[model samples]
Target: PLYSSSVPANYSDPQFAVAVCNNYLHENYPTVASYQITDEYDAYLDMVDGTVACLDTATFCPAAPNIRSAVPSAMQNTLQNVLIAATKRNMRELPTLDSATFNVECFRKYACNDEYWEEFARKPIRITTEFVTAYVARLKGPKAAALFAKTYNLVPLQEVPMDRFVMVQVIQAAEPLATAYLCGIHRELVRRLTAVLLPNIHTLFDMSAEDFDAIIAEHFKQGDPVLETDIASFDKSQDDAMALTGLMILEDLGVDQPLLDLIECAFGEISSTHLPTGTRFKFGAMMKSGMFLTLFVNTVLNVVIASRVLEERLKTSRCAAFIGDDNIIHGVVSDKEMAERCATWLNMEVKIIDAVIGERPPYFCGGFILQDSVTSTACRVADPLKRLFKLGKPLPADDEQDEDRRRALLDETKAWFRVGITGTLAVAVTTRYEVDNITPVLLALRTFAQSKRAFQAIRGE
Candidate 1:
């Protein structure tokens, strides 16, 4: 209150707010209001159904289809962007994937392997949102919950603080099926839901079926590879599994002892909390696909900044341009000026991207949809925890103090994330979420293999 409104307080942080908000999600809303993938199994595909659809554009599958044909080229562009980043940094993975045993099948079969991921690791400053945007609606139902498990395998041992990397790698190699479960299974959900929902889009529904067919055919003329990324949605199959997780979350709260005891008594039917409980609640908060908005918004930050940096750098030197007047910096161009100039350049680029990316992810704009499945997971699980335990509610903004705290936290975690850049292992600490993630990875693999429709979905037939 005392300080100038524009100037942030010494304590508050904008980055921390951005980072913590990374986890914030409002509950589900009808994704397009057209239909529901009633089967828990297929529903998983529905969560990330957009992955392939979104990837079909030039940004990701530049070789597959014309970028003009694609609808939302942002994420796909982001994928290509990473490749460009790797190239600019002179990383070898980009060339290797292009030249070696790298195709969609390989990407599918060996994507979870650490040795294989080395190419990606070469330019080690990977934002973990790597596989993130590639998948669709990653919050909601058993399929999505399982995704959290399967993805755990792909995380580097450096990212994951345990020996599970081997197990996740083993499961991927011996049974690559687990890697495909959530994405492969969730296909049916998207298929069915699209049929129901797309019609509701006034433009699409308003047309006669024949006219719509013509329009769709025209839409298809672009011939993007995204059309092929179909997968199953077996989330329906995990109803019991989701329920068991609910019970486990309940146990975490120390409130629902009877429910916990019931779960304990259930024996064969009961399941443990495979993914982190925090993930479960995050899913609940992102009950519908609205959270994709969150995911897209957050991930785009890197894409915008990095791409702009590279583009601008390309304009002058292959590296970032230094700002110096004829007289000023014949020697050293002070760091502050360099940082300020780069930041200013990035800001304009981001705004340009925001305007150009038509399907611009609804950063804060969202559809809040919580279904029975999400509600069960959220309230049955997360709600009980909140009711019984003290939930941490963020107080009013304290700019200066929060900023210092944010800086400290960034300093703490920056080393862990920015590891390979320095060519060293700097594992300072392991969070509880980092422990034993490999177990669920095995579960995800098993589920992917056992599910029949899931297999069909993986091949994108």
Candidate 2:
């Protein structure tokens, strides 16, 4: 009922569908659903006070916006149509819930008042039994599964293991719309408390290695004892109760009841279908590992835990950064006693490893090599040089070299040139590698150039 039966020609496009939905909400409830487009980021509607705040694509999802933008317009449009069609068809076929059943089971489960429920019902993003069923079905469908696989460059659903497939598919598919919807509702609340609760938090979304290193360099001292710890089984262990704690935090921060109901309903029960075997199952308690909302909920919980730990235990903690379960706390020494107490408070096992101060010359934390300075462990210039030297050898005789083999070697060498040597040099430039270190990298690049020239000569290029 959200859309008319006579769908527009552009209805197949997901962005178009989102636009239509946004326009309808704007027209119907101007006060509640005010629309504003900014030059900062992608389009997202803020349902709280009706402000579509587009800060920056890099702030939320780094790769998707860039990747989506780079995709050919025709291909992008076609893909959008494919996904939107599947979503629409699946949604239409789902059975509607009667008022009595919807009330007793869902309403009672969330413990939401009738006023909030009515408010939620009026919203465009209402979560019903049909909506959940349809969303899961779309994920399980071949078109959607294949689209997701191609988008992420993963193995197709048929080849993926049942256990891994469920979470992987869910995480990849439940984005843009689902994530944006949940984020819009919680953004204002998170913004209000971020300074007070998560003062030292860094990199809410993904960032490049150079950017990450710069942030670390700014916050951490040269000789600081950095402790890297991880929360054991963060996503798998959490249930609605844990999510309820997050909701309570938001409620304490002045979130309205209707928004609370929406959050609870969206994340309350975990649902997914096994595409390979066609088996469907639902868990009433735990938030599934792959739900988009799980990350946001866990992030909120982490902020609370971080604030508590900083206040109660590590009062001198210089900085704290969390990317899901991976945690880095600067100025914390390797003390198992404090770690054990922190683990107990979080109700999750914490493994504290001496990241920076250990005897190891360069320790890896948050995907960066930490020595006297933070740098990337990836894109080493030597890798391509080694490949080039090994593969660039000339045959005993020019006639002995197979043309196809020479061409393949040339092609592979080109790929490694761009991916390895050039890429490494680019990162090194940004990271400001020591002058002595750059000498070796430059030497490797020269070797690559010499090898490439030799191969090109053999190919008569």
Candidate 3:
């Protein structure tokens, strides 16, 4: 009942759940738009009906005769299950725990609960044979099947060993269906929290440069001290207990028990294989499932929950904005005290920086240079350009001798420039070209291009 008003009336419909997942895919995986996935109701039904012929011939799939054989039927089944469970729970009807009941003792009890930890320790979800086949095929194409089958048979419904799991580094390619489902839950959570708990809570999840600029401008006009800090080891740390406590806090805030259980089951007991050494080990913590959005939404939920607790103690609300680990708070009584309190309650280290009245404005969220009357995106553009220039430096002849290396460098350079130009121009237009001079920006880019040309000339390309 805490966020009952924000819950959609049509949330019980299966189409609504599918639409949520598809909308997540459309934004996160734009390539899905090229296929018949988004904007088509029948395609989703086809996928649910165990027909994935669409993905088989899609350009994203590697060229292989038996590519369809590697498709994980379990993945489709899992997606179907996720949809059914997602729509089954009406978030509006859930009982809300009083915020007054939350305290340090309650947090400690959840953090040190052995039963919850045991559930996480055990393999909550099996990595079936279908999953392994699809993973291997996508990684190495159909040619890998003969050798892979010899080592790991194509047995259906069997759980793959922990050693067979490869850590997917790319966000978009990690676990699409799971990511979409989690993102859908995250969207609902954001809406609920924003409507009831925190008015600007939505900005923390996917804030744009303009959204951040507006936050800085609003706080600046109010003349409040803005404090920025990060939750240490948010993604890489092996501290599942604290992360679990954060989720429990969300449950206390009226999040459905089923959704929380699904999140825990999906991410718990993650194991990855070291391809070269063939060593395998389980992640002793959360955020190791390689599901970027899972880690992302988890981080957002924790930050919001921490802020809510902080607000109760400080007796002030709606003074925080964050995106991922980067958090900013203003209009609090004591910035240092608030930061320390937040760090203590979250059981994480925080490095605090304050934006003062006389000093130069802080680089909020590492993108905008924020001051009382001015804002600039110079640092945002320049930081990436610096990295590109460093990477664009021609390597030694031994390294450059590989044609693939040369081609990859050239391709990366071209892509960075293309996207960078568009982004820089977008910033220029957004700022109306008045906050900062645009000439230096263009000249620096020109110099970078000239240096690249000189390098190519030296290579006689």
Candidate 4:
């Protein structure tokens, strides 16, 4: 009674509550919905259908027509309903419809057509409502029940002392999208379920004739160099071999199994506990293409397990660990030889990209903080419009071709996006959804804008 108004101590995580209410989706899922590629297994081009579109957007063909028309109404309506219900459920701290924002248009289309995702937008309420309610449905189906039985069911390693619940951080894992997408072939659910009530999103492994056309269309655009990136996704593809739905990646890759088994034993699909409030029983708390989220969870388990070993060998004072996402771990290794060997032993598939020796400044997790310099990492595209402005420099020669004026306009327009109202809208929509993330990027982005303003004041408007 004393804490009737207060949040439950155990579930105080406001971020998790909102995310779970939204079905534990990858923050990128909303964007992916617009650009989702059909999974028709391109043997010649990249095997991972969505990697190119998600990672680097510059080289791809234009987005589908009416892209924004699909998500806003559906998303806004769905969020309104979900948040209101949660408010009634006493989860009032969660972000509600009152202050909601979305980037439906910010989600660019790939070379794919608009028809594929038309269903999602046309009937937003049904899909969004199902996503929220179905996440908590009880287990009854064979495949879902099987998955429920397996996830997060591992036991702790016995050799690690009970007092040493201590785990040292070794490395940082960043760019979760790229790593997870490359491994997306392994994102196959236990056995893909098609029926409603036993729902798995169709876009995960199934592609229509239209879907196939859209994915293959990328191959024809911008010619050669980018084509190599396409082949790379295929070459590194793991979808065909591994059954990595749960903590299975640990065993499949021959990494730290004891710890994975331990974590599974301890957690055991924790989301399973939150079954939906309904008379009918359902199984599976996960969405079908909610692969990156699952991949992230598994990657974290691997990092946690890897930390235990690091704790035993290196004193906490001498070591530092950073995780950019889940898979990549970066550190200043005191015992370089031992760290390398240990990293390999955990998973040779986990490549350690060494960069201190290179002439170029290394950028990690979307910022240029190396060598005391800062720069905006490109937004999927190598040259987003923000980088086009020449700051105080005068316009190109008037005798310059029409191309010059247009490029100058584009540069200024990008400048508008960088520090203007459009940029504010982007930040509000993007940062609000993922409450926990506030990338140390220059949010106001007056970096170059200020310089331009100073020059304009000194010279002309």
Best by lDDT: 3
Candidate 4 lDDT trough over 10 residues, lowest sum:
65-74
Q: What is the C-alpha RMSD of each candidate to the true structure, in Å?
A: 28.8, 20.0, 20.2, 26.1
* Tens digits of lDDT, candidate 1, 274-295: 1223422232211222222212
Point out the higher-scoring one by lDDT: 2 or 4. 2
Q: State the lDDT of candidate 3 residue by residue for 18-97, as single tens digits.
A: 65664454343211122221112232312221112222222222111100111112111112222223334222423212
Clashes of each: 50, 0, 0, 33
Better of 1 and 3 by lDDT: 3
User: What does candidate 3 score on TM?
Assistant: 0.41
TM-score of each: 0.17, 0.39, 0.41, 0.24
What order do you get sorting by TM-score, best first?
A: 3, 2, 4, 1
TM-score of 4: 0.24
CA deviation > 4 Å runs, candidate 1: 1-74, 87-175, 178-343, 352-363, 366-461
Model 3 worst lDDT window (10 residues): 62-71
lDDT of 3 at 59: 25
Please say which candidate is ahead in TM-score: 1 or 3: 3
Give the winner by lDDT: 1 or 4. 4
Superior by lDDT: candidate 2 or candidate 3: 3
For candidate 4, what's the RMSD? Answer: 26.1
The alpha-carbon deviation from the true structure for residue 33 of candidate 4, after best TM-score superposition, in angstroms, is 20
Runs off by more than 4 Å, candidate 3: 1-183, 200-202, 222-224, 233-237, 250-292, 301-319, 333-348, 372-446, 449-461
